[PDB]
C-alpha cells in the first residue's frame, strides 16, 4: 500500500478535530467534528477538498466528539448522527445541515456512536455515565440500556457491532472489554416492539430493556483505559495508551465465539501491532470498508497503516505515512468507500488528505 499526501487544511476554530467519517451510505463526501460543529467536505481531483456546509450547535459550550452515517428510512437519503460533551444526539440532514431531531439520555458526555450493520435505524451510543444505549431512530424509542450490576464501572469510550449485528463489544476507562449479545429472544423481541411502538396510537410509554449483565468480560488485555475496539470477524482488535493494538479472542484458541459463556475466565492473544508516541487517550484506529486495512495516527502526526490481508493476524504488514508539516496529534482517520482516499484529522484543527497510488 502506497499513499501520497495531496492536500491539507485547517478549520478556523483552532480546537481539536476529534472525529472524521466518509459517508459509505450512498456517496466522495466526509464529515469532520470538532469545537461545537460538524463540517461536510467533498473530495475532487488534484487533491481538492471542497468546503460544503456546517452545522453549528446553539450552545457555544457544546463539544462534538463523534459522528456516524446512516440512511433515512422515511426519506431514503443519507443522515448524520452527531454527539459529544452535552450528551445529546443530533440527527442532521446532510443536504441542508438542518437538525431533524435529537435524543437525550441522562445528558452525560457521549464518547461514541455506531449504526447497526444491517438495520440503519439502530443507533448505539456509549457514555461517560458508564452505560451503552440502543436507540431506534425510526420510532424514536430507547430500546435498551446496557449498564448496571455488571456493566462498566467508569466511562465507556468505544464500542462495535460484529458483522451481523448479533453482538456488541464495548470498552472503557475501567480497563475492561465487555460482550453484549443482542440476538437473545429478549433483545430480538425488544427490537420488534420498538418498531411496533407509535405514541400516537397508545397510552403506554415505551419500556426500555435494562441489561445489567454482559455475556463475557475481561480486564486481561490492556493495563489502562481501553479507548478503541473493533471486531475482525470473530476476533477483536483493541487498544489502550500503551502504544499497541492487541488482536485477541474470548476463551481458548479453539473456542467458538458463540459458545462462550459469561463465566469465561480465559482470553487468547493472536498478535500485537506496536507503534510509537501514542500514549494520550481517545486516539482511534479505523478500517476500510472490506477490512483489508487498519489505520492509526499518533500524537506527533505520523500515520501507521496495517495490511490485514495475510493468513494470521500477527503477519500484518505495516506501512508508515509522514509529512514534514504534519506534526499535531491525529485523533481519527477515515477511508473513502472505494479505499482510494485516506483522511486524518488533528488536534490543531488540520485535515490531511492521502490518495492511494
Ligand atoms: C473530548 C473527547 N474526550 C472523550 C473527552 C477525550 C479527551 C482526551 S484528551 O484530553 O487527550 O483530549
Curated annotation (Swiss-Prot):
N6,N6,N6-trimethyllysine: residues bearing it: 114, 185, 201
Biological-process GO terms, alphabetical: cellular response to leukemia inhibitory factor; facultative heterochromatin formation; genomic imprinting; heterochromatin formation; negative regulation of DNA-templated transcription; negative regulation of transcription by RNA polymerase II; oligodendrocyte differentiation; regulation of adaxial/abaxial pattern formation
Impact reported for residue 110 to N: Impairs interaction with EZH2
Chain segments carrying region Required for interaction with the matrix protein MA of HIV-1: 66-220, 218-357
N6-methyllysine sites (modified residues): 114, 185, 201
Disease (UniProt): Cohen-Gibson syndrome: An autosomal dominant overgrowth disorder characterized by accelerated osseous maturation, advanced bone age, skeletal abnormalities including flaring of the metaphyses of the long bones, large hands with long fingers and camptodactyly, scoliosis, cervical spine anomalies, dysmorphic facial features, and variable intellectual disability.
Role, per record: Polycomb group (PcG) protein. Component of the PRC2/EED-EZH2 complex, which methylates 'Lys-9' and 'Lys-27' of histone H3, leading to transcriptional repression of the affected target gene. Also recognizes 'Lys-26' trimethylated histone H1 with the effect of inhibiting PRC2 complex methyltransferase activity on nucleosomal histone H3 'Lys-27', whereas H3 'Lys-27' recognition has the opposite effect, enabling the propagation of this repressive mark. The PRC2/EED-EZH2 complex may also serve as a recruiting platform for DNA methyltransferases, thereby linking two epigenetic repression systems.
Oligomeric and partner information: Component of the PRC2/EED-EZH2 complex, which includes EED, EZH2, SUZ12, RBBP4 and RBBP7 and possibly AEBP2. The minimum components required for methyltransferase activity of the PRC2/EED-EZH2 complex are EED, EZH2 and SUZ12. Component of the PRC2/EED-EZH1 complex, which includes EED, EZH1, SUZ12, RBBP4 and AEBP2. The PRC2 complex may also interact with DNMT1, DNMT3A, DNMT3B and PHF1 via the EZH2 subunit and with SIRT1 via the SUZ12 subunit. Interacts with HDAC, HDAC2, histone H1 and YY1. May interact with ITGA4, ITGAE and ITGB7. Interacts with CDYL. Interacts with BMAL1. (Microbial infection) May interact with the MA protein of HIV-1.
Name the record gives this protein: Polycomb protein EED
Species this chain originates from: Homo sapiens (Human)
Gene: EED
